[PDB]
Amino acid sequence: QYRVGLLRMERAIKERMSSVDIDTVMPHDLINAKPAAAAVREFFGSSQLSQF
Amino acid sequence: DRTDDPVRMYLREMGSVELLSREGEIAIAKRIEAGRDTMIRGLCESALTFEAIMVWREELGTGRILLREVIDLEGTYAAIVSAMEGELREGVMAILDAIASEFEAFRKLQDKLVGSRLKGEDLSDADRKAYEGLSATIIQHLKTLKLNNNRIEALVEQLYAINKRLIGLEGRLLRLADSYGISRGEFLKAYFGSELNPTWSEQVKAMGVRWTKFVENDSQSVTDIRSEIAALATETGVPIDDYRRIVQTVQKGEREARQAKKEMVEANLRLVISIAKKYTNRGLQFLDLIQEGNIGLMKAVDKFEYRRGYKFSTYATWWIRQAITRSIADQARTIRIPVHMIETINKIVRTSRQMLHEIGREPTPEELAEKLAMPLEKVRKVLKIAKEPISLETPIGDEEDSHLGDFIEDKNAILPIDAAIQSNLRETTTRVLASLTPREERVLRMRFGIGMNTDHTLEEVGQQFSVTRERIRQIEAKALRKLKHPSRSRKLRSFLD
Amino acid sequence: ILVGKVTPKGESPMTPEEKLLRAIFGEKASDVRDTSLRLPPGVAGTIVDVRV
Amino acid sequence: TFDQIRISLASPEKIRSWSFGEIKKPETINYRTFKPERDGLFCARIFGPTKDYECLCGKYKRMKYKGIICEKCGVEVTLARVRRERMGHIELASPVAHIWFLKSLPSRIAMMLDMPLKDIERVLYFEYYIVTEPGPLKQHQLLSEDDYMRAQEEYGDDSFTAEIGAEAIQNLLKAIDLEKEAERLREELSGTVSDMKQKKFSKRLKILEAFQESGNRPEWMVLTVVPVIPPELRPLVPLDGGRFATSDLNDLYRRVINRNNRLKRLIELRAPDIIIRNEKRMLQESVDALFDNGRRGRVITGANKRPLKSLADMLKGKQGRFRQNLLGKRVDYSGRSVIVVGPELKLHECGLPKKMALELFKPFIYARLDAKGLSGTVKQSKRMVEREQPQVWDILEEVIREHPVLLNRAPTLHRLGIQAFEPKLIEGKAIQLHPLVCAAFNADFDGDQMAVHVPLSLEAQLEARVLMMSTNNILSPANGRPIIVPSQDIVLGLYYLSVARDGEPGEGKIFADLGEIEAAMDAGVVSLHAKIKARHTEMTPEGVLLRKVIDTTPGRMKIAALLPHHPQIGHRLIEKALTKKEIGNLIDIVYRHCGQKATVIFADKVMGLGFKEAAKAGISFGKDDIIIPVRKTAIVEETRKLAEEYEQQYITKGEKYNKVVDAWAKATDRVADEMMAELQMKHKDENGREKEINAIYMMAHSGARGSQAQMKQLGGMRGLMAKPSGEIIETPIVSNFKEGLTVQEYFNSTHGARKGLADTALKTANSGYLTRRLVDVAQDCIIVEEDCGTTKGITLRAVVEGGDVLVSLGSRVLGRFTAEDVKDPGTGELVVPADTYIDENIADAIEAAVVQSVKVRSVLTCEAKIGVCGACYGRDLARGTPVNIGEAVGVIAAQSIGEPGTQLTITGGLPRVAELFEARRPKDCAVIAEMDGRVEFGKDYKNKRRIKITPDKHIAVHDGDYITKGEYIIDGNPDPHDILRILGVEALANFLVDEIQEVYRLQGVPINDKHIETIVRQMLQKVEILEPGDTGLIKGDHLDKPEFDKEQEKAIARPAVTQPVLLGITKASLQTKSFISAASFQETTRVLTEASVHGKTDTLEGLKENVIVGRLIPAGTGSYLRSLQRVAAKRDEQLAQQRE
Ligand SMILES: [Mg+2]
Ligand SMILES: [Zn+2]
Ligand SMILES: [Zn+2]
Incomplete structure (x- = not known):
């Protein structure tokens, strides 16, 4: 289930990284944490x- | 090959049928511009549209809406806010003052032509030349004026209504005359060259035996009714023989514009399909999100010019995102949370996520109020707003039996015990009131209402017995203090709880 | 009564007999509805801990 | 009032008339204030006020106004009850096809105009355009490309129009007319072969006649306006925690409203033609999922992942009208408490806890306190009983004096599961249940919550005393065997009292009276081994019998004194060992000859007597109780040595079977037989008196809890364990539970026993399903007519296998009125009259002489128009009296057939019964012959010999042999459908009855034949109409139609004939006249459509119909009240005829 949540987070990060540039970007600013803990909560x- | 799926069906039409318009966006924009130009050219002609736009513009400029309702402010200075507003206003006023005489001459020429067509005599002694000269000036004035689409919409609607009425009349005439051996396509060709003479059906019996039978006892009254309807509609709006071609060309232009818009939409729907993948599981299905973003996509083509960066990709994606976020914020919580409240809660959750990512543990709700520079009490009410109503059919145990809907109580269903105290409170009150005076008991009951639910006030119950004064209040107080002893108020001492 | 829960609400449906009884006893209609938690039918009795 | 509920297609105009406001926004309430929106799923002015007589915006919340409507909110002030009844409607921008008629087993939308659902589903989803008004461009061409739409339209630009989608299908339905289509199909069905086209033409003509007769227009399956369920049905109550709990239907209606608003915005915006049609497709899918949600892609809610239920999903599962809503109502005034033995109580008195009697009899306690004057008002009474004052307990014991309470066990398999008891305010918090009655309940006291109910009405409180009392439920409805027989303890006590031994103190010491025996036993002169003589009145002849000095025993005299004084009974019954079977026959004979009062009093006494003589006996199980056979080690060694002699040379399967069947399967009963022989021998002590009988042997012989198989498993060889496929274990398992089982043998034991344990939990589900099917197929089988005018009846022959009788003919025919007078063989003497009840004396007289099958009137031969008769069902199984009008005969039979479930068993027991009741074709379909004499060969090279007509694969007959009708080619498992098609209906009924009896005897649960007869009759309620004229229906049809149709055709003339068809219990609801009875347990998406398009109106004639509707049941006391209502209506009509 954490692998499923990490796949969802990877999809979200792939959808979000296309907008925010990687050069001079705040660290861990595009990685989400809701589906990570949401999977274990469920x-x-x-x-x-x-x-x- | 039965898919039995709306999403798959929608995708198939978009893919196997529609082709991605690559580098044809600018071509579709130019086609839409050409359609708008055709519609404007058909509108600014000798008909009721030019008279309605000129008469409506006569009152504007001084005491009516001069700008933002007749001519677009951007279109005026596009080829050339306070300075631009007054500059275009004076120009529009001067144009109207110079074209008033031309519009009057055009209206006079149109009236003369309508009279000549309704009487029979052909006005050829420079009448048509004067009419064309008066119409060309009005057309050139309206075309260079750069008017808006507000009045254009009403003009197009009136033209479409007139065209529908004329088409219905022509179809009725064709159905009435084509009984024996007549057709439907010849009615227009006959009415285009046999509309001046009133006896069109009688003077058109050159050849064919079916024409005589259709004109005599077949459609002799139908043709007269159609001619009368046309004559009545000519005075109500634009005349005949001049507004028909105008509405036809304006309808053709509108159809071309709509076809170009539909082609651009179908050649871009794949875009909406691609954008509706990140908003999945946000309160709306995938195909629902696609067909909702289609609204914003169609709204984007309505405002799509040849500005910098002619690529329609960015604009389409922005409008689909705005339409999905505008609709996801409404049909996703089951309570129709407002759009601004949805964006506020999204900002709050984003701030909480960034705080969990950078600062550390989850911040208190009172801290989020100051973290966003908003009122402290407003953030306390933003959260706890029924984020997601749980389904009433969800399972409650290890199996799918005895869902939550079967365990929810009822805070409004009157329990039988509480009804028992109601019935007894109706019995225990009729017994305590039986000891009072008959008229006094009646007025006390009217003060509240045991049988009659119309609870009367002091004066209202007073008029029913005697002079409406403090005497009724006095007797009410006396009665209230009467049944307060241990003898009368014995069974009620344990009734009030 | 285990924990007195006082929940403010709106004016209940004014019934004529109840209004007459309230006027007779002189009391006023309580705007709050009784919602205090109570022990279900059992032999529980003593209370071990009451965490707030 | 109301009656005769009828369903049909919901007209858009009628749907708008039902609703009170068109909803145009998918908004339920506000996020700030929890109030209904203006136009949404939750509306005030559309569905009524949310508060009782409290209008919106606090303007008319004083209740003074009842019909006044608000101005700003526009909501009319009315109590909250109207919010549950007010409906709503959503006028869709485009039509939508009903999921029940579009996607289902019979495509009701496809049956119109004879178009298959595969193309109708494509024309609805806007995939393939449909052509309308053709005039090239064939009618219903189903073209999708724009070539023929635009390129082919270049023929003059005139007379070219076609539509697509829900609007296209609606216009197509409007174009087809019912009368003309039915007339065209009539000539197409007659005067032609109709080989393959008939299968669809029959359904099309049926649907057309249903639409024309009911008055429903054909273009109503597709609905432009969808009605919305009221907001109170799908609530949005704020749960504890600020999280609203919205119903499943609320999300579906919100989705439908969103789709409708999107379609309206697209149409008004002039969207692309591929998006508007796609929008219409999305709206159609949403409306489909909102109704059924199963035929579509199972649209899930945006929040949860569970499949959202819909208007159809609710009615299907238990959570709708099936179980949760109508049938299984969570009735209040009830109580569930763990039960404990109540031997100090009478048979008609159940223990009720004081803490539960107050919560159960709260209104009754209030009434007793008000009438007695103890409490002034109801509020003061509630304040009194709430604290459990000492003065209310005296009123509780007074109110609960003759008020029976229904004792409802968790699982019920028959009508004895709900028995009313006069409650006793016993201490504690457990229902003190009677020991004799818990056997009928199926409730042991190892933990069994018996739900107690309290009848509120004066009739229900009295109905529970005349019928639901435990004293009236002595004889179980399954057969003529009393269910109040002692199960474990009383039977053991009676066996200990009846065991007689020649060696004991006080041999032949004659006693004066019954009390002399106990007086001498208390003095230690006479024991309880039942070997002493005394006096006792047997009362065998007519009138009083003298106190003859019998040579009986003292132990059998304590039970003999409890027997009522009556001829044909006395000490002659107690002379046996008084086992469980013998004690049941004794309670049966005392009820068969004497009354119910004496029977119940004897059962109460014997329970107390058996209890007092069982505790004083000392029947404790011990180590020496289960005596292992001393001749066991030698036999085990010889068996294991014989298992090795033939194994040296070795086929391996043959040697294994010789070592598992003849080696272990054989001689395992030899060791068990030797153990039983060594256990039966009464060991004599050195003083000439036997020490004692083994307690385990006493329990096994008396029938309380022992048995030969259980004895062998406990102390014998333990047999051989099973396998997952069913094979017997080959390894040696020589050890009993008294000895220490090693790991392997116990693992095999728990491998063979877990299968049976799962069968107790898995096959019981099949038993519940069969019981549900039977009660819903036999619900209409209600005794209404006492004596019908029929003379023919089913022949009842005593079944026999080998050379002995399996069931006595006197028992199979007992309790059934004879059709023709049975003639005793040998001499032509009328032993039984023609049309009289078969009492026990008549059955004994019949069994006195060997006789063949006797003509017996059964429910199958009933010529009654409605329900079943009284002279055909015979005797009710509750008591010895004949069946009375009003009893739910079908429900009783269904319960009696479902009771053997949970212990039955493929084709073993339960699956075979389910296959025979459902009338399915077995794996080896047998074909009946029907030919007489010679039989010829079938057609040439047609893959099989279908049938040979001679008017004048595997085969079991020859080509020239003389074949007689009856012998059918099969290796077993015949087919009842073929039995009815070839052989008579009585023959099929006899076959089904014999098969069910053989199954129940192989399992061991004896069930009466009439209980299967009523089910077989309910399965024969349909008859295939073979009428050549005046009726085009050839498929099965309810018998009431030939009762009415065949009578109407005679008033116009072609003779009509119809052969009876047999359908399974599950298929009874498929063609039943009532739809509520069929839409209750069957599939709710097909029977409703089969009743909606047909306009089937529920006359409320059956039992399940009135139960769902809530009215009085037409069976039992409800049946008698219905008869009284009918006679009162007749009297009122006669009175009206007097005054013109
Ligand atoms: Mg038990
Ligand atoms: Zn209001
Ligand atoms: Zn009968």
């Missing part, structure tokens, strides 16, 4: 394996 929030 895994521990309402997953069938983490049900109880």
Whole structure:
């Protein structure tokens, strides 16, 4: 599930890096963190394996 | 090969059918400009459009809307804000003052031509020459005036309505005359050269036996009704034999412009398809997002000139992004959150993400109010705004049984116990009121209403019994203090809780 | 009563009999609705910890 | 009031009339204030005020105005109940095809104009344009390219027009007329072969006659305006935590509103022709998903990932009218508590916890406090019972005196699952249930929450006392066996009391009365081994019988004194060992000869007697209780040595089977038989008196909990475990549970037992499905007529296998009225009259002489127009009395057939019953012969011999042999459909009954034949109409149509004849007259469309119809009230005829 979240984050970073230039760019400014923690939250929030 | 999918079907039409217009954007823009030029040329002619635009412009300039409603301010100084507004206003006023006489002469010539066509005599003693001379001046004045599209829209609508009425009349005449051996395409050719004489159906029986039968007892009344409708519509708007070709050419120009716009849209829809991939899972389906961004794409072609950077790619992507963000902010939360509130919550979440990325742990909601330079109480109400209403059919256990909808309580359903106290409070009140005076009990009940739900005030219940004064309030206070003893108010002491 | 929850709300539906009873007893209609948490039917009894 | 609910196509004008405001914005409420929007899914002026008589903007929230509408908000002031009834409509910019009619099994939209759904689905999605008004350009050419649209249009630019999409399909439906199409199909169906085209022509003519007869226009499947469910149905209540909980339908309606607004904006904006048609396609897909959501791509909500349910998805699953909404209503006034044994209570008294009786009888407690004067007002009463004052407990015991409460066990498989009990305010918090009644409930006390219900009405409180009482549910509805028989403890006590041994103290010591036995037992002179003589009245002959000094025992006298005084019963029944089967026959004979009061009192006494004599007996299980056979090690060694002699040379499969069947499968009953023989022998002590009988042997012989298989598994050889495919294990497993099983043998045991455990949890699901199918196919089978005018009946023959009888003929025919008077063989003496009830005496007289099958009137031969008769169902299985009018005979039979489930079993037991009830063609379809005498050869080279007509693959007959009708070529598993097509209907019924009986006997659950007879009759409610004229329907049809159609044709003349067709229990709802009965458990997207386009109106004649509708059931007390209503209406009509 973290690999799925990382694939989503990679898609987001690929969609966002085309707009923001890489030369003189603020570090880690295009990498998102919502789908990273959202995947583990769903895994521990309402997953069938983490049900109880 | 049944796909059974709207998304796939939409993609197939765009791909297997539509071809990406490469380096043809500028050509489509030039075609749209040519269509607009054709529409303007058809509009500025001898008809009701030139008279309506001239008569409407006569009141403008001094006491009516002179700029921003008749002629575009940008189009005036485009070939040449406060200085440009007054400069174009004086020029438009001078043009109207110089073209008023030309418009009057053109209207007189049109009236004379309509009279000659309705009577039968052909006005050839320089009448047509004077009419053309008066119309050319008005056309040249309107073309160089660089008017706006506001009145142009109403003129095109009126022209389309008149053309639809004329087409309906012609179709009715063709259906009435083509019973035996007549056709529909010959009606226009007959009415173009046999419209001056009133007995058009009678003086057109040169050859053919079916024509006589269609004119006698077949369409003799239909042709008269059509001629009467045409004569009534000539005075209401533009005359006949001159507005027909004008509306035809303006409709052709509008059709060409619409075809160019549709071609540019279909040759760019792939763009919208490509842009609708980053907004997926934001409250709208993929095909829904595509067909919503199509609205913004069509709105972009309406304003697309030959400015710097003629590539329509950037403009199209900006407009699709604005249309998706304008629609995703509305049909995504199930509550129709406003667009500005959606952008505010997006700014708040972006600030929170940047703080988590750079500063560290999650900041307090009170800190986000000052981090964005906004009111502290406004940020407290921005969050907790029902971000996503959970589905009422979601599962509650390990299986898909007993969803959340079956466990939600009801805060409005009157419980049977609370109805029990209602019925008994209706019984316990009728018993306590049975000990009071009959008229006094009646007026007290009218003060609130046991059987009648119309709760009357003090004076309203006063008029029903005696003179509306403090006597009713006095008797009400006496009654209220009456049933306060342990004998009368015994079963009610445990009723108020 | 476990924790008294006082929740402000709007004016409840003014019924005639209830208004008459309130005027008789002189009290005023409480604008707040009772929402205090209560123990369900059981033999719970004692309270171990009350974290706020 | 209301009655006769009818459904049909929703007209756009009628849909607009239903609604109160057109919604044009997909906005439910505001983000700041939680109020409904102006025009959206949640509206005030469109669906009513959100508060009870509280208009918007606080203008008319005083309730003084009831019909006044607001000015700024425009919402009319009305209570919140109107917000759930007010509907809405969405006038779409373009039409949309209904998902139920477009995408389904029968393409109801494709049946119009004879166009397949594969092309109708393409013309709707704007893929292939359709041609209209042709005049080159053939009608329905289905062209997509613009060549024929524009290039081919260059013929004068006149008379060239075609449309595409939902509007095109709507215009196509409008063009086709019902009358002309039906007339054209009538001549196309008659006077022609109609080989392949008939299959579609029949459905098309049926749909056309439904549209024409019902009055629905053909162009109504596609709807321009979609009605919206009221906002109260799909709520948006604010959940705890500020997160709103919007219903699934709210998101679908929001999507539909968004699509409609987008289409309206595109049309008004003059969008490209490929985007507007694509917008119409998106709107059509959204409307499809909003109705069913299954036929489309399963559009998921934007927030959650679960498939969004729709108006069809709700009705399908349990969460709609199927289970959650209508049938399985979460009834209040109920209680669920763990149950405990109640042996101190009577059979008609269940223990009720004091903490639960208050919450259950709150209104009754309030009424008792108000009538008694203890509480002044209802609020004061609620304040009294809320604190559980000491003065309310005395009122609770007074209110619960004769008010029976329905005891509802978690799983119910028959009508005895809901039994009303006179509650007793027992201490604790557990329902003190009676031990004798929990066996009928299927509820042991190892943890079984028995949901308790309280009837509120005076009739329901009295209905639970006349029918739902435990005393009236003695005999189970499955067969004529009492279900109140002692299961485990009372049977063990009676067996210990009835076991007689020649060696014991007090041999032949004659006693005076019954009390003398106990007086001597308390003195230690006489034991309880039942070997002492005394006096007792048997009461065998007519009238009172003298107190004859019987040679019986003391132990059997304690049970004999509990037997009521009546002829044909007495100590003669207690003379046996008094096992579970014998004690059940004793409770059956006491009920069969004596009344129910004496039967229930004897059951109550024997339970207390068995309990008192079982605890004082000391039946504790011990190490020496399960005695391992001493002759076991030697036999195991000899078996394992014989398993090695033939294994030396070795075929391996033959040697294995010799070592697993003849080696371990054989001699495993030999060791078990030796163990049983060593356990049966009564060991005699040195003093000449036997020590005691083994407690495990007592439990096995009495039938309480033991058995031969369980005995062998516990102390015997344990048998051989199973495999995943079903094969028997070949390894030696020689160890009993009394001994230590090693790891491998116990692993094999848990490999063979987990299969049966899953069958108890997996096959039980099939049992529940079969029970659901049976009660919904037999719901209409309700006894209404006492005696019908029919004389023919089904023949009941005692089934026999080998050389012995499997079931006695006196038991199979018991409780059924005979059709013709049975004649005793040998001498022509009428042993039973023609049309009289078969009492137990008549059954005994019939079984006294060997007789063949007797003509018995059954529900199958019922000539009653509606429901089932009374003289055909025979005797109700509840008691010995005959069946009375109003009983749900079909529901009782369905429950009796579903009760053997969860313990049945492919074709083993449960799957075979499901296959026979559904009437499916088995894996080896058998073909009946129907030929008499010689049989010829079929056609030449047609891949099979279909049939040979001689009027005057694998084969089992010859080419010239004389074949007789009845012998059909098959290797087994015949087909009931072929049985009906070739053989009679009574023969198919007998075959089904014998098959079900053989299955239930192989499993061990005896079920009465009539319970299968009613199901078979309900499966035969359809008859194929072979009428050559006056009716073009050849497929199956309800019998009421030939009852009415065949009678109407005679008033105009062609004779009409129809052969009965048999359809499965699942297919009963496919052609049933009522749609609510069929749309309840069957698929809701096909029966509704089959009833909507047909205009099927529910007359509420069945049971499931009134249950869903909420009205009184037409069966039982509801049946009697319906009869009273009918007679009152007749009396009112007669009175009206008196005054002109
Ligand atoms: Mg149990
Ligand atoms: Zn209002
Ligand atoms: Zn009958």
